[PDB]
């Protein structure tokens, strides 16, 4: 109701904060928000804005968000239909383009999840700018998204995936390993 | 400073620009006045003794 009885995301965020729900229920709240976002036909800036507001507000909310994210890619991602999944990815990208730290945990794991990842990447590209985005990625530890070590043609799959959605540096990586 | 509206009515002619029909407020001393509630007579209770 709060989410839907609010013009901008900011207002919604404020309303949520008014409630002052316990550090227990923050995760639940986040989940609910995510669900709501999914429900809407396409990705809205509103939800993202709300998330940002929450995130800035407190470390516990950040933690909750992180937890939610973990839950998603791990166990709740494969349940969603495509459009919804895409929307979710976009939202996550938005969150991660600025507010979140790029911390990401990613042959077997490739159906819905892979497409979600792709969507996220696209979102990031849109927000940032390709080269800049790449640089940012490099800056963080990032072993899951781009594993540096060759590991006997395991990076080939990743490269292929990257190629499927217009991206760079993969080729360079491939060259490096031989 | 955020220039709160608390400060406006305290120094009207200063902090507020174009004040009109504004009366002047008071600006006071502090009231050390101690009343005994335990039925006792002339006691330094709430405060502390001199040095010497």
């Amino acid at each position: 109701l709060v989410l839907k009885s609010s013009l901008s995301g900011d207002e919604a965020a404020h309303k949520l904060l008014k409630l002052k729900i316990a550090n227990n229920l923050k995760k639940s709240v986040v989940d609910i928000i995510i669900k709501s976002s999914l429900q809407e036909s396409t990705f809205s800036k509103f939800y993202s804005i709300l998330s940002e507001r929450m995130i800035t507000f407190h470390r516990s909310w950040q933690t909750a968000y992180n937890e939610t994210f973990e839950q998603n890619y791990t166990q709740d991602i494969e349940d969603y239909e495509t459009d919804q999944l895409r929307i979710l990815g976009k939202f996550w990208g938005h969150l991660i383009s600025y507010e979140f730290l790029p911390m990401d945990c990613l042959e077997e794991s490739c159906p819905q999840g892979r497409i979600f990842i792709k969507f996220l990447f696209q979102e990031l590209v849109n927000e940032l700018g390709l080269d800049e985005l790449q640089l940012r990625l490099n800056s963080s530890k990032l072993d899951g998204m781009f594993p540096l070590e060759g590991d006997a043609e395991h990076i080939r799959y990743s490269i292929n995936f990257f190629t499927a959605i217009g991206l760079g540096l993969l080729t360079e990586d491939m060259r490096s390993r031989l | 400073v955020p220039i709160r509206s608390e400060y406006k009515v305290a120094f009207p002619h200063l902090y507020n620009s174009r004040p009109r029909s504004v009366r002047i407020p008071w600006y006071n001393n502090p009231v050390s006045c101690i009343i005994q509630n335990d039925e006792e007579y002339d006691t330094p209770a709430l405060f502390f003794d001199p040095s010497l």
Partner: protein, 429 residues
């Protein structure tokens, strides 16, 4: 002539809107983009420094300016704030004026009157970072993010403008419902209220909904930013409510809990479609009109509530940018599907496209309605609809769209469903 021709393209294969067969050609002339809208033209000139200077000089020659009264009597956009509105630099201001003069010279006054009081000249420069303009009822502030200080989190209302080559969200464009549109809305509300001493509360409510829907469907994204519009909505809604309460000869705030208004007609209520229970953005009106702004301190919104959060129509309307992006996606998808069908030799079924059925502009579903062949010959229809205003007494409030050619651009059954929930559930009601 030549420029016009270039804009058009060649006759055998003309350009689409704002596209050119080459970049060099586009570069050549000072004018870049044109669009007349219904006798309200929009010209984007892109000058170099040398070019600008010459123009300025010419202007000076025409009309000497020793006291410097060119910034004075210059159409700037009061809706925006003093920092983000067009800055009055003695170069930039002069340049715009010169341009305007040139334009005026180009047409004879006898054929059409291009007045300075009518006109507006925004100028992007090293000193002016906000390319501002009002189109169609929107006030758009295009602010490139390279010029922006800290590239803050994308708000709601802002369209992130995208570079088509690199796919980068390279600029921002902030929206606000132009004051004229707000005024129009207010007028409409007044009309609805006036000449309604009788009317069945429900009829009035319906009218209000229609008005509100028109307002919100037309500028979905662009409402959020404009506070005046929000205020008006709050006021308008309240007025509407009071109309109903006027009928019942009271207006005692307890005797009309939101139940009676927002409850749908299918539980005996009026079934209004509120946009009033929003906590409006308040701000330092000292620093609001002046300089710069941020969303701090919410104002009350409309009523005393029993912690009954009545949902708001806006959250059930897909903001325009999103819609456009969706359209871009699903039309491409549709095309792909068609191609596939062709390859495989089949008629493309409407059950396969289900999923992206009520998604797009025009809504995908405009292809496969059972009366399409005839509407393909109805060309120049939008214009006709627009011009309807001058033929009819009471006009369409949804002139901008048209169901048959576009499909239902909004849907509000979800809202209906949720209002009841907000009001406790059915039992409570």
């Amino acid at each position: 002539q030549e420029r016009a021709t270039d804009l058009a393209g060649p006759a055998n294969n003309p350009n689409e809107f704002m596209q050119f067969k080459s970049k060099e050609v586009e570069k050549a002339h000072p004018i870049r983009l044109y669009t007349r809208y219904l006798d309200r033209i929009y010209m984007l000139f892109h000058f170099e420094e040398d070019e600008g200077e010459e123009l300025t000089d010419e202007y000076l020659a025409e009309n000497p300016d020793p006291n410097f009264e060119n910034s004075i009597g210059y159409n700037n956009r009061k809706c925006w704030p003093k920092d983000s509105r067009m800055r009055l630099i003695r170069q930039d201001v002069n340049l715009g004026r010169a341009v305007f003069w040139e334009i005026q010279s180009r047409v004879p006054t006898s054929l059409t009157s291009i007045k300075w009081e009518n006109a507006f000249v925004s100028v992007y420069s090293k000193n002016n970072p906000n390319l501002l303009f009002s189109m169609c009822g929107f006030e758009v502030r295009i602010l490139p993010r390279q010029r922006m200080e800290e590239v803050v989190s994308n708000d709601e209302g802002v369209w992130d403008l995208v570079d088509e080559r690199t796919k980068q969200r390279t600029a921002k464009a902030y929206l606000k419902v132009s004051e004229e549109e707000i005024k129009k809305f207010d007028s409409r509300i007044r009309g609805i209220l006036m000449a309604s001493g009788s009317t069945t509360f429900t009829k009035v409510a319906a009218k209000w909904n229609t008005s509100l829907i028109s307002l919100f469907t037309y500028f979905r994204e662009a409402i959020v930013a404009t506070e005046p519009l929000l205020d008006i909505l709050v006021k308008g809604e309240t007025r509407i409510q009071n109309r109903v309460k006027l009928g019942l000869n009271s207006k005692m705030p307890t005797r009309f809990p939101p139940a009676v208004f927002y409850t749908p007609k299918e539980l005996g209520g009026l079934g209004m479609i509120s946009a009033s229970h929003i906590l409006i953005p308040a701000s330092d009106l000292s620093w609001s009109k002046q300089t710069d702004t941020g969303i701090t301190h919410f104002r009350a919104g409309m009523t005393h509530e029993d912690e009954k959060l009545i949902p708001t129509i806006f959250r059930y309307i897909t903001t325009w940018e999103n819609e456009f992006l969706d359209s871009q996606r699903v039309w491409a998808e549709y095309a792909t599907k068609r191609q596939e069908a062709i390859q495989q030799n089949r008629r493309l079924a409407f059950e396969e496209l289900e999923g992206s059925w009520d998604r797009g502009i025009p809504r995908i579903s405009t292809l496969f309605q059972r009366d399409r062949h005839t509407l393909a010959y109805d060309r120049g229809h939008r214009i006709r609809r627009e011009f309807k205003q001058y033929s009819l007494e009471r006009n369409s409030p949804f002139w901008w769209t048209n169901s048959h050619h576009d499909g239902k651009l909004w849907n509000l059954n979800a809202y209906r469903t949720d209002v009841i929930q907000a009001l406790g559930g059915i039992e409570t009601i």
